């Protein structure tokens, strides 16, 4: 235990979920690599340390403890070597930029319009539930082959998997403090199995253009498919973050723009600025805030800390994206910040595989929103609360417009 960091013993899991930025501002200054007792792990808080660990030859991926309890093996985020190479080859075809550009407009734009048509003349909406989450899940769900799974159900599953995979608190002995918090993750997985097993049965015999059919068949000898137990953990990884994060990025970008009314006006007037607005939104409130980790494979010294082999380090990219070595007043959303590197998609061989797709989902969603409701305003009678340490985003976004 590091003596000058004794204050970390009193940091709680609830504090980090409600708002992790004050604790992490101290970590960035005091200890860029620091052991946080309630998380049971070293955490990397600065841009230099996160990028170093994520790209180091002396580290490889490891799943967080609660992530492992939630996803099992081989989750694409938690494995390395030949298995990781295979799972990357499995997921990459539909995410290739030239491929996304073929069909992303015809996928997302009619989905955004469908959800907008439900409320665009109301004069009020809660955009997280009514727009950002539905467009995110319906887009990806259709790409995957889950057309028949309602957006309400996809939203419920990612919320249960989020809480399970971020159920990280440990007690004085390093044991999970809230073991009952994994039960709703187990229940989501059981429901997913009941829906998806018959789809896999069908795709094995009758392949189609759905992404999960391609995960079963691509790259395989004739008449063979990847075993469903081998792909289900990556299906679960998708049904948490890939379903959740484009909605979170959309919504955080909107909260940021509302916080800078002159910048919201600029972006509504000039939608070619939407990609810049989104990149700043991701830096400003990173959707994947501290959900992944790496483990040393040899003894290594990082940020002055001598780590043995086998040491996990959580990558708190959402903190690294407020590093004041890189950014001026990072807690302020600013469209006009210079377009600098950021870590909201991670780094290294385990960096996000879906960046290009995700950026287009968020872009098309915001384009359609501002076209439909150009006089959109935040409802300032309602607070926006952000929640989450592992995955972070606004829990609601009440808006109003003159009808
Ligand atoms: C704005 C939305 C998104 C954000 C901010 C985001 C961010 C991230 C981050 C931070 C990681 C971990 C990287 C690391 O540990 O260094 C990651 C991993 C990953 N993401 Fe994205 N993600 C988003 C959307 C998506 C979508 C929509 C997909 C799929 C269609 C996707 C697929 C993946 C995959 C497959 C991985 C695992 C990569 C690996 O471990 O090799 N992401 N993402
Ligand atoms: C793409 O989904 C994830 C990325 C990182 C950690 C958990 C996820 O579900």
Numbering used by the authors: 5 to 407
From the article:
However, GcoAB shows poor reactivity toward syringol, which can be derived from sinapyl alcohol via high-temperature reactions and represents the aromatic functionality of S-lignin that must undergo O-demethylation for further catabolism via ring-opening dioxygenases.
Thus, we prepared the GcoA-F169A variant and measured its guaiacol and syringol binding properties. Each protein variant also crystallized successfully with guaiacol and the structures showed that the orientation of the bound ligand remained consistent with that of the WT enzyme. Even the largest reduction in side chain bulk, represented by the GcoA-F169A variant, retained the ideal reactive geometry for the natural substrate. Furthermore, comparison of the surrounding active site architecture confirmed no significant deviation from the WT. When NADH and O2 were present in excess of guaiacol, the measured stoichiometry of the GcoA-F169A–catalyzed reaction was very close to 1 molecule each of guaiacol and NADH consumed to 1 formaldehyde and 1 catechol produced, without overconsumption of NADH (103 ± 7% coupling efficiency). Moreover, GcoA-F169A has a slightly improved performance with guaiacol as a substrate relative to the WT enzyme.
